[PDB]
Every structure is written in C-alpha cells, then in structure tokens.
C-alpha cells in the first residue's frame, strides 16, 4: 500500500505492506485525512517524533475511514469510522489508558499517531483497536476528518465550563483568539453552543480582502486586528469577555486574555508555544486572577466521549460554513497542494478512496 | 458604644450610638473580633476603604457575637452567630446579591465590612440583616473568629475541585505557599480534606527556631524554605504538587506554580498583590498549562454555604494546632497588643464581651 511520509532528512510516497489487524482490531481503508499544522511542523524539522527504529514517519492524526476487515471486533463492514490519536506507548498500558483518559496521560506516557511515537493515518489502510475507533453517521463521512478537531473543542469545553460550575455562570460573551483551522471551527462551535452567546469575537492579524475575515463576519462575530488591538485593550474598545478561547499558540496572549475577562470568566488555553521570555507584569495577573475570580484552563487532545459529542455539534454547523472552511480536497495522485499553506488556503485534507 | 477604629490620617478607641436593627436585622452583642493583614494595612496608609462621608473605618472582618435583639427574624436571643463580610454597595442591591452570590460581585458592586466602604465588627455592638447571619455551634464561640478565614479556603476548594471534575482527578501531594495565618489554617484543613492527601509541603522563608515551623512539621508536613528552594525547583528536590495553594501574594509564585504542579493539577491562588512587572518566561508557562491539563483558578471572599461548611471542618480540626495557632486573645482594655505584629505572633484576637 501507498502512504505520505516525511524520511529522516518534505513530504513523500512511500510503498509498504498493509497491516493486518490484531484481535481486538479491525482493518479500515482511509477515505480522507485532513492536514494540520502539526503535520507542517514535522515536514519542517520535527523529526524528533519518530518512531523508535523507523526511518520515516507517515502523517496525518485527523482521519475517517470504512471498516473492510471487522475481525474480532464488534463493528460492521461498511461502518464509517473516526480513530482517536492516542495510543499506549512502547512500555504498555498504564493507569490513563486503563481508566480510559488518555487524554489526559503525561508527557512520555502515550504516543500520538501522525505525530509522535507511532505512524499516522496517511496511508490506504490502517488498523486500531476498537475501543479507539467511532462510528460517526455516514453521511458525515465526506468531511469526517473534522471530527477530530472538533472534538479538541469539546474537550476544552467541557473542562473550561466545569471551572465555573460552582456557582449560577451565565456568559454572554466569548473571544477566539486565533482565525486558524482550531480557532474558525471553535467561533462556528460557540455560536449554536447551549451557554447562548450573543456577542463572539475573533482575533487575526489579516489585512482585506481575506477569507478568513470573511468568515468571521459570515457568522456574525466581530474581526479583531491584533495590530490594531492587542488582546489586553479589547475590553477599552469592545467589551470585557466571558469566555475566551486561545487558540494562536503567543504566550502573550496566555498572559493577557486574563486582562481581557469579565469577572468570573474562565479562559481556555489550546496553543503549543516553545519557550519564550518576556517582562510582563506579573502582580496585575495574579490580582485579577484573585480579586474578579477568574480561572485559566489547559487543554489537550481529546477521547472518545467528545468524538461522540463532536458528531452532533457538526450537524448543527451551518453548510456554508464547512463549504467555505475547507479549501481543498486534493486526490492521493496531487497529494502535494494539500500541503501548500498561504493565506487563501484554510483547511485541505487528502482523499485515499471515496464511498 | 466603645468601638477601635483607624481616623482619616493607628487605631484607636471611639465611642459612638449603639446601632438600632432594621426590620430583617438583629442586634448583636460582640464577643472576639480577629485581627487580619488587611486591618494591618489599613492602619497603615490603606484609608481609601472609608465610608463615605466618613472621618473614620472600623476595624475588623472576622467575627463572632451572640444574638442580644433578634428583632423581626427567625433568630433566637442568646444564639451565637458569625456574620458574613459582604454587603450591597451605596446604590442598592444587584444580581450577585439578588442571586445570593455575593462572594462573586466584581469590584464596585459591594462593601466588605471592616475593609471598603462600611463600618467593621470591632464595636460592643452591631447589627445585620439575617440572612448574614451565619448560626453556629454555641461550643465554637471562643474561636468563633476563625470560621471566616476557614470559610475563604472552604470557597477555593470548591472552585479549584470544580475544575478537575470533568475527569477522575485523585491527587495525592498537596503544596501550601504561605506560613501566615490563612496558609496554616488551609494546610490543617488539607490534612483532614476527604481528596486524602499523603504528603503535604508548606512554603515560608524563616530561620529555626520559628513557632510557625514548628506548626508544620506537627501537622507532619514538610517544610520548605523558598530561600533554599524556589517554586520552580520543588519538583526536583520534593515532587510535583497535584494541589497547590497560593497564599503569599508574592507574583512569582502565581507564575511559578505552574511549574510545581503535577499533570493534571490545579493551583488556587488567594493572594493580593500590587502591580509589579518582571521578566517571566511566558512560553514555559502557556505550554505546560497546555500540555499537562493544568488549571489555575482564582478566589476571594465566601458566602454562607462556606461558613457552615467551616464549621464542620472546624470540629475535626486538632485541638493542639487551634491552641498555637491563636498567639494571643486580649481584652478590650489591652487591644493595642493584639496589633503588634512579629515573627512569633501568629493569629491573635479582642475580647469585647463572653457568654
Ligand atoms: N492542545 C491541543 O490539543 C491542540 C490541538 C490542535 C492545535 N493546537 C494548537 O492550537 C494553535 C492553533 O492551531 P491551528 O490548527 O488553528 O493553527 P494555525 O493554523 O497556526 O493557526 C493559528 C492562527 O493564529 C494566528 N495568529 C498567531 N499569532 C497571532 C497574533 N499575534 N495575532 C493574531 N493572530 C495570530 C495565525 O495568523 P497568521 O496566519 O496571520 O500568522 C493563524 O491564523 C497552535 O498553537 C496549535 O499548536 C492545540
Ligand atoms: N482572596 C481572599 O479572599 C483572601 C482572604 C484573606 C487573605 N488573602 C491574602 O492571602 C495572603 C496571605 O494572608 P495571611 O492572612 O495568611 O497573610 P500574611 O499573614 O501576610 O502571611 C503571608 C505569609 O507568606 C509569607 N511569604 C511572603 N512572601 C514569601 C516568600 N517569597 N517566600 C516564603 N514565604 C513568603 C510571609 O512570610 P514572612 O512573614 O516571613 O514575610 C507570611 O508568613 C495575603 O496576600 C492576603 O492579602 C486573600
């Protein structure tokens, strides 16, 4: 079988034989895999993910796919499923896998497919365990690679909002910080969110015309230019926010979203920065943080219950919405454009097979 | 009425009218007022908290008295009862205090008695209306004063468990910053803290021998000297903390917590600091409050349901640590005493009346 791989030393074919599934798994031949930055940091220089004795790396952790070989397994041939990422690392099971949150396992304990530790999805075939593998309806199949991103949302979500569960929250305000793939899907997500918000904003850096502005004002939020507005003089301009929601991955924005809350607002914290040092005042932080009770929440990957939630969050998502998100659908045959970024191009995916 | 007081421009004895109950309000005898760091800050320079129209603040936010007027309410004379700190601002009522969330009113939406914009509990007598009043075991009225401070970490623990309660959280380390009365108090309370707790740390900064080491090391907790180990440094010299709690208003900490907290734990912070800006390395921060599903949430105040939880938490409290907790319970006569503030004074108290 074909699969899209980065060799130790961009992105290539690569030929190798297809799995066979293990008891307890099932055999699923990809239909599409959509590309993410992660994958883009890999063909950059990432190479530090590797498998343990492999000299290549096959991408992509955002798929769908339809089960051809049930095996052992309780799922049906022609049942459309979505894998998790999470995978048991190298040394076995452990305690997050064994009371299924993964999610939720520490650095080193798991490997992430497409990214690190264990190959990825951008391949004909794959296989998984059928704890790890969701059966979405068919006819989300087409776009089915969303579920995964989605589903980040409903995780950080969840965490975000349980932060605010000890008293009567009633938010009327969210801000995404971010007009990245995470950050458009998440501004879509809030506006049929059961919380009610009437006012959403957006934070980008993107001169008109831009389709990602576009979209931001389709659904009716408001374009924040951070040039224009940094992140802590939006309540001066706008208004203070219940909910925020980053999603750019500057470590300035971590520090001033606090700034940016309404009393007892919580903000949700998604990017992956690397180090980076800075003057920042530290006592105005910690003073708001106490005296207006407000909580800061780190969330990362995702398991199954938020897979399951994702699939009917994605049927409330406006059709023009997810028709405007993804820009590209490319065939295995032109499998490079999917991976040419410029500002026009939002979300692309790689199609292995159709049906 | 004999009443201690701070005069616009230390404190010092005033007399003034008996106050006369409102309808809804009871009339109470004082019995203990406990002195606190703000009553320090105020006789300080912190005047800026005074009444309206007044050349004068009362003193005091941690009290106990006995029911001597129960006036139109359902309290009975002789009942003891501890008030609550926060009342509707100048311009009336409003939503946190209609929905009986008083703790969550945001800056300019109420008073704290004894703090900012009204009268304090350090007089013969005062009145309340009685849904502030909090009734309490006629046992617990020598140290009555300590079910207001008991009461602020029964407020963060809530929220702060709220936050990992999306996922099966258990910790087992938990982290006190802080060896002043607020941060003793919580680390007696997280040694009988149902979470189960096995090894428990305090963070202070005194040189043996020291009364408040010695309160640590009792309760079977270790001490950790922040001038041998930073924050930030903990977790290779001790552990990572599952729970930490700020109780120094030193910035750093709020920052650094992040870094001594295990995966998956959160960090409440209580204290107040003045604005102060310094070089922090921001990037560390938002990556590991990200990859690690940290949470940081902050709290202030608390309202009737923690006062009665307090008083659960008080019984189970060790009878020694309440008697080297409390350095010193004067009368009124000698009140001065119970402001001199050394390394050897810990919690101290005025005796108004008994009974
Ligand atoms: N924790 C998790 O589970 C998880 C999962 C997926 C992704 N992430 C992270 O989430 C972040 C967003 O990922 P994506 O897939 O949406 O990433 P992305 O495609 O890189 O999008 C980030 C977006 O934010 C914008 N941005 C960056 N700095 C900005 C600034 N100062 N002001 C305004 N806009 C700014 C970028 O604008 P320009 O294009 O104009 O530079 C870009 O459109 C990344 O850090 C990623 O690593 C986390
Ligand atoms: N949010 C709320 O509702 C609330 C309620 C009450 C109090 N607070 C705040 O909570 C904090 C604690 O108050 P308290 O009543 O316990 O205050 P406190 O009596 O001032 O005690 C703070 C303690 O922390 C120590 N400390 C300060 N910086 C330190 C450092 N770098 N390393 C080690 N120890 C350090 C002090 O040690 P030294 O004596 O050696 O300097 C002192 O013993 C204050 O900031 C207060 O404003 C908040």
Same mark, same amino acid.
């Given at each position: 079988?074909?699969?899209? !791989?980065?060799?130790?030393?961009?992105?290539?074919?690569?030929?190798?034989?297809?799995?066979?599934?293990?008891?307890?798994?099932?055999?699923?031949?990809?239909?599409?895999?959509?590309?993410?930055?992660?994958?883009?940091?890999?063909?950059?220089?990432?190479?530090?993910? *590797?498998?343990?004795?492999?000299?290549?790396?096959?991408?992509?952790?955002?798929?769908?796919?339809?089960?051809?070989?049930?095996? &052992?397994?309780?799922?049906?041939?022609?049942?459309?499923?979505?894998?998790?990422?999470?995978?048991?690392?190298?040394?076995?099971?452990?305690?997050?896998?064994?009371?299924?949150?993964?999610?939720?396992?520490?650095?080193?304990?798991?490997?992430?497919?497409?990214?690190?530790?264990?190959?990825?999805?951008?391949?004909?075939?794959?296989?998984?365990?059928?704890?790890?593998?969701?059966? %979405?309806?068919?006819?989300?199949?087409?776009?089915?690679?969303? %579920?995964?991103?989605?589903?980040?949302?409903?995780?950080?979500?969840?965490? $975000?909002?349980?932060?605010?569960?000890?008293?009567?929250?009633?938010?009327?305000?969210?801000?995404?910080?971010?007009?990245?793939?995470?950050?458009?899907?998440?501004?879509?997500?809030?506006?049929?969110?059961?919380?009610?918000?009437?006012?959403?904003?957006? =934070?980008?850096?993107?001169?008109?015309?831009?389709?990602? %502005? &576009?979209?931001?004002?389709?659904?009716?939020?408001?374009?924040?230019?951070?040039?224009?507005?940094?992140?802590? &003089?939006?309540?001066?301009?706008?208004?203070?926010?219940?909910?925020?929601?980053?999603?750019?991955? *500057?470590?300035?924005?971590?520090?001033?979203?606090?700034? !940016?809350?309404?009393?007892?607002?919580?903000?949700? =914290?998604?990017?992956?920065?690397? &180090?980076?040092?800075?003057?920042?005042?530290?006592?105005?932080?910690?003073?708001?943080?106490?005296?207006?009770?407000? !909580?800061?929440?780190?969330?990362?990957?995702?398991?199954?219950?938020?897979?399951?939630? $994702?699939?009917?969050?994605? #049927?409330?998502?406006?059709?023009?919405?997810?028709?405007?998100?993804?820009?590209?659908?490319?065939?295995?045959?032109?499998?490079?454009?999917?991976?040419?970024?410029?500002?026009?191009?939002?979300?692309?995916?790689?199609?292995?097979? #159709?049906?």
């Amino acid at each position: 079988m074909k699969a899209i !791989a980065v060799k130790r030393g961009r992105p290539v074919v690569i030929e190798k034989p297809r799995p066979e599934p293990e008891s307890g798994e099932a055999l699923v031949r990809t239909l599409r895999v959509g590309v993410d930055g992660t994958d883009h940091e890999v063909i950059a220089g990432g190479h530090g993910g *590797f498998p343990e004795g492999e000299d290549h790396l096959v991408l992509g952790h955002e798929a769908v796919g339809v089960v051809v070989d049930p095996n &052992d397994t309780e799922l049906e041939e022609g049942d459309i499923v979505v894998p998790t990422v999470r995978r048991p690392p190298a040394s076995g099971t452990n305690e997050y896998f064994e009371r299924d949150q993964p999610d939720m396992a520490p650095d080193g304990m798991y490997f992430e497919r497409g990214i690190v530790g264990a190959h990825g999805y951008m391949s004909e075939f794959f296989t998984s365990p059928e704890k790890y593998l969701v059966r %979405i309806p068919r006819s989300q199949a087409e776009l089915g690679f969303l %579920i995964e991103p989605i589903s980040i949302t409903e995780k950080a979500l969840e965490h $975000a909002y349980a932060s605010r569960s000890a008293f009567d929250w009633d938010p009327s305000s969210a801000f995404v910080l971010g007009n990245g793939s995470l950050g458009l899907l998440t501004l879509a997500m809030l506006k049929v969110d059961d919380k009610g918000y009437e006012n959403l904003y957006c =934070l980008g850096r993107r001169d008109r015309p831009d389709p990602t %502005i &576009d979209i931001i004002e389709e659904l009716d939020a408001t374009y924040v230019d951070s040039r224009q507005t940094p992140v802590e &003089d939006v309540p001066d301009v706008y208004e203070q926010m219940d909910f925020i929601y980053e999603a750019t991955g *500057f470590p300035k924005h971590a520090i001033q979203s606090v700034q !940016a809350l309404a009393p007892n607002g919580v903000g949700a =914290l998604l990017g992956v920065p690397s &180090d980076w040092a800075f003057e920042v005042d530290a006592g105005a932080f910690h003073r708001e943080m106490v005296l207006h009770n407000k !909580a800061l929440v780190g969330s990362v990957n995702s398991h199954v219950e938020h897979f399951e939630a $994702a699939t009917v969050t994605f #049927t409330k998502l406006p059709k023009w919405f997810l028709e405007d998100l993804v820009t590209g659908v490319h065939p295995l045959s032109e499998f490079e454009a999917a991976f040419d970024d410029d500002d026009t191009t939002i979300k692309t995916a790689i199609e292995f097979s #159709t049906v």
